[PDB]
Amino acid sequence: LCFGQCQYTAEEYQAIQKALRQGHRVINLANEMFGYNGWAHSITQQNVDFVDLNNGKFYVGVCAFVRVQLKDGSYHEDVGYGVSEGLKSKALSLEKARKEAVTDGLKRALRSFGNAL
Amino acid sequence: LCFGQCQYTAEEYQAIQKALRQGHRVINLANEMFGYNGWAHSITQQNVDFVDLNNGKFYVGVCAFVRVQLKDGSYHEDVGYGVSEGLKSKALSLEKARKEAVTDGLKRALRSFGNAL
Amino acid sequence: LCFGQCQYTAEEYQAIQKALRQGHRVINLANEMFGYNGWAHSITQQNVDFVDLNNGKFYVGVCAFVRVQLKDGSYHEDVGYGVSEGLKSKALSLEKARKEAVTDGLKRALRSFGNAL
Amino acid sequence: LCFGQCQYTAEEYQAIQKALRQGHRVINLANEMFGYNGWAHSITQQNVDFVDLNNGKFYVGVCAFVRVQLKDGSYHEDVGYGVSEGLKSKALSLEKARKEAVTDGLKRALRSFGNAL
Amino acid sequence: LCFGQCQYTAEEYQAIQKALRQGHRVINLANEMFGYNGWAHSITQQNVDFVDLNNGKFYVGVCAFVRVQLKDGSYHEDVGYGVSEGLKSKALSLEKARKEAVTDGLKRALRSFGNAL
Amino acid sequence: LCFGQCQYTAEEYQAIQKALRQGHRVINLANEMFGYNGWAHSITQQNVDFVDLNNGKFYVGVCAFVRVQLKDGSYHEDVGYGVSEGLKSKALSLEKARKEAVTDGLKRALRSFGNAL
Amino acid sequence: LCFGQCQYTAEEYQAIQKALRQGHRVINLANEMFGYNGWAHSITQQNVDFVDLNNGKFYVGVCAFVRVQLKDGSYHEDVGYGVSEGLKSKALSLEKARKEAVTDGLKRALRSFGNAL
Amino acid sequence: LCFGQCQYTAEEYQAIQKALRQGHRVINLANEMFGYNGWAHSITQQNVDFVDLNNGKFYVGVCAFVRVQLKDGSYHEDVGYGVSEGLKSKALSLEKARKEAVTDGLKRALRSFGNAL
Amino acid sequence: LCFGQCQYTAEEYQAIQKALRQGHRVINLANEMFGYNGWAHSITQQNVDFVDLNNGKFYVGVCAFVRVQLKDGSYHEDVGYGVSEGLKSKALSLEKARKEAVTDGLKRALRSFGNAL
Amino acid sequence: LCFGQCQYTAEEYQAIQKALRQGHRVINLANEMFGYNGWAHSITQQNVDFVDLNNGKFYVGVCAFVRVQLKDGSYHEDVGYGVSEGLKSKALSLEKARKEAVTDGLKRALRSFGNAL
Amino acid sequence: LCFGQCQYTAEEYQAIQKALRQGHRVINLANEMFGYNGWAHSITQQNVDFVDLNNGKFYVGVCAFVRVQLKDGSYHEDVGYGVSEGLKSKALSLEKARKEAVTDGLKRALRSFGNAL
């Protein structure tokens, strides 16, 4: 059926659970375990907490919520934070903080499914 | 069926209830009890109560609502709070407070299902 | 069927009513009576009434609405209030008040189903 | 069927009407008459009319709308008011007023079904 | 069927119309005529027109819309007004005005169904 | 069927039209013609145009829209206005104006169905 | 069927068209042509353009949109305007303008169906 | 079927197209071509561009969008503009401008169906 | 079927495509190609960019989005702009600009279907 | 079926893919490849970034999002930008910028389907 | 079936996964792997972080969220950032930043499906 409506078989579910019980690495692990079409992730919220200028340096902090969903319908959502310090230009700091926040949120949300992740 | 619409069997329900009657640890317990696809959790609301600057120290407090849902449809929601004191940088304090709030909310919401959690 | 659509049997309903006629304790009682998947609770509204600073002390009051729902569809909603006085730090006072409000609301809403609760 | 969609039988309806023709007490009466799963109640609106400080005393007034619904679908909604005077602390006055308002609204809404209530 | 979808029988409709052709009293009359599950009422809107302080007295006026609905689906809505004068305390005046407004609205809306009401 | 979905019979429609071709009086006429469950009325909008204080007198004007609907689905909506002059107290003037506006709107909307009304 | 879903017969449609090809008068004509349950009208928008005070006289102008709908589903909407000049009191001017606007809108919208109207 | 869902026959469509290929006049033409129940028109938006006072004269301009729809479902929408100059009173200018705008919009939208209109 | 749900036949589609491969003129072409009931157009957005007063002259610019839809469901949307310069009166400039914008948008959107348009 | 719900055949899909693998020109190419009824395009968002006046010259920049959709349901969305410099009049600059933005967005969005575009 | 509802076959899924395990280049790779109708992409959010003027130079930073969806229903969303520095004109900087942000977001979102991308 369509994504979010299919169901696993007994053997497939058992194998997946056994493997589970035991950021490119985590993405590769997820693709190998669930399959390229077996999982999805999205961003539900993001905002900038503060942007401060020190003596020629920028300090930035970003928050982001990441939602991970499976083919069956189960989901997990967690928060991620990104920080950049000691940089000279605003753009690089903001870019790094925003990307790191999303990556950390994805990692934390994907850890909830098992110890392997 | 799809998540949120399936139903347990008599034997499975009895076994789950017997086991129930009796934050990585609680996550592992939940995955072992309900299964990797048997439970879900989400964040419904979050806000910053206050950010104050003392004599070189930051005090922060964060609130968060966490909703836990099962395969059948039952759900439980509870509040969690995170606090950071004595830190030097704003970003670390905010990150720690936000993550701790979500973790505490998840723990409290997952305790409502039984004594084992 | 799915949660919120199932119906009780005559014998089960009679037994539940007889037991009913007669905050970890109330949670345990509810789980024993209705079952781990037989009841649910949620938070519909919450706000801070006031935060005042006395001579080195914080006074806080919080309101919260708690909704309790059963497997059949019946529901009960009630208000709860939490107060903290004599504390030194804002964060602890707020946390205690917020949690106590939710707990009191849950207790009051769960009392409406019978004398046992 | 699900709550809000079932229908009474002729004998059950006749018995209920005969009994009807004739705040823990009213709750017990309702549970005995309709059953623990035969009625529900909720809060639709609530607000604080005024908070005034006299010579060391607090005067408070609260309004609340309470909606009572039955298994069949019939419903009744009424207003309730709570007042607190002569108290010393704001939190206790607010708590008492809010709870009393909800209780009075529930009583008034539950009186509309018959003389027994 | 569910409330708001059932239909009367010819004899029942004829008897009800004959009886109709001819605030606890009106409530009792309605319950006797339509039945405890044969009618419903609700509040759609309410507001405070003005609150004025005279030489130690409070003058208050409240408006309210009341909607009455039957089992078949027919409905009638009317306005009600409540006034309090000569009182000393704000809370009692507001409570009396608000309750009287709802009661008057219910009476006026219930009069539209026939002369008996 | 439910209200707003039923249909008339040929003889009933012919009789109703013949009678039609030819504020308690108009309400009684409508109830006698269409039946206690054959018509409905509601308020869609209402506002206060102005409140002015003359030399000890209040002048008030109110607008209201009234919608009348039948069992089949046909409907008619019209405006009504209420005015009060020469009164001493604000509350009585407002009450009279508001009620008169609704009554006039109902009359005008009910006149559109025929000459008898 | 329900209003807005029925369909005419060939003979009835032909007769209606022949009669069509050829404010109480227009209302009577419409009721005679389409039937008391064959047409409907409503108000979609209304506002006050201006209220000016001359040397003891009030000038008022009101706009209104009127929508006319038939049993089949066809509809026509048109604008109407009402003006009052030379009056002494605000309330009468406003009432007359508002009613005249609705009447003119109804007339203009009902003229679009044929020359007879 | 209901309006907006019926379909033409081959002969009727051919005749209508042949006639088409070739503001009371345009309304009469449309009623003769499509039928009294074969077309509809409505107003989707209207606003006042400007109102300026010259040396004792009013200049007004109004915009309006008119949507024309047929029985099958096809539709056409176009803009219309109305202007009044040299008038003495505001009300007459506004009325004339508003009505002329709607009429012009209807004409322009009805021209899109063919050369005959 | 209803508009927006029908489908072409193979021969009709082939003929239409062959003819396509090759503002009253474009309207006539569209009506001849698709048919009077084979195409539709609408306005989705419109606004005034600026209105400036030079030495006795008005400069105006208007934007408009035009959406063209066919019987099958295919659609095309494009922007149109209208400009008026050297005029003496505001109303004529605005009218001309607004109408020209819609016409240009219609032309551009209708050109996307083929070279013939 | 209706647009956005049909499906290609194996041979047609293979031919289209082979042709794909390899602003009037791109429009002609798209119409020849997918067909006059095989593709659609729309505008989802547009805004003006800035309008600055230099020494007698206007500088303008416009952004636009363009969404391209096919008969099956696949879609692609991309951003386009338009710039005008050295012009004398505001209207021409704005018109050119807005049209160029939409054209560039359409081109970029249509390039994503293959190398031929 | 329609896009977002179809399902892969076992052999096709296996081949796609094997190929996956291993910005025109990435677009070509995606079209070759999934097919011209096998994938889609869209923009969910975009904003300008800051626009600063240095000594004759413009510094710009843009954020964008890109959502990639497949035929089955699986999806992945990621953030992209674009920066422009050292440019002389605002328009070129903004255009380059906005386009680069979307391209980077597309690349990052498309990398999540496998190592080949």
Numbering used by the authors:
A (entry chain G), B (entry chain H), C (entry chain I), D (entry chain J), E (entry chain K), F (entry chain A), ...: 24 to 45, 68 to 162
Paper text:
Central to these functions, RAD52 promotes the annealing of complementary single-stranded DNA (ssDNA)8,9 and provides an alternative to BRCA2/RAD51-dependent homologous recombination repair. Instead, cryo-electron microscopy and biochemical analyses revealed that ssDNA annealing is driven by RAD52 open rings in association with replication protein-A (RPA). Our studies provide structural snapshots throughout the annealing process and define the molecular mechanism of ssDNA annealing by the RAD52–RPA complex.
When visualized using cryo-EM, we found that the two species of full-length RAD52 represent open (RAD52-OR, peak 1) and closed (RAD52-CR, peak 2) ring forms. The 11-subunit closed rings exhibit features similar to the RAD52 NTD, whereas the RAD52 open rings have one or more subunits missing. The closed ring comprised 11 subunits as observed previously. RAD52 forms undecameric (11-subunit) ring structures, but these rings do not represent the active form of the enzyme. RAD52 open rings form more stable complexes with ssDNA (40 nucleotides) and RPA compared with RAD52 closed rings, as measured in pull-down experiments, which may explain why the RAD52-CRs do not cooperate with RPA in SSA.
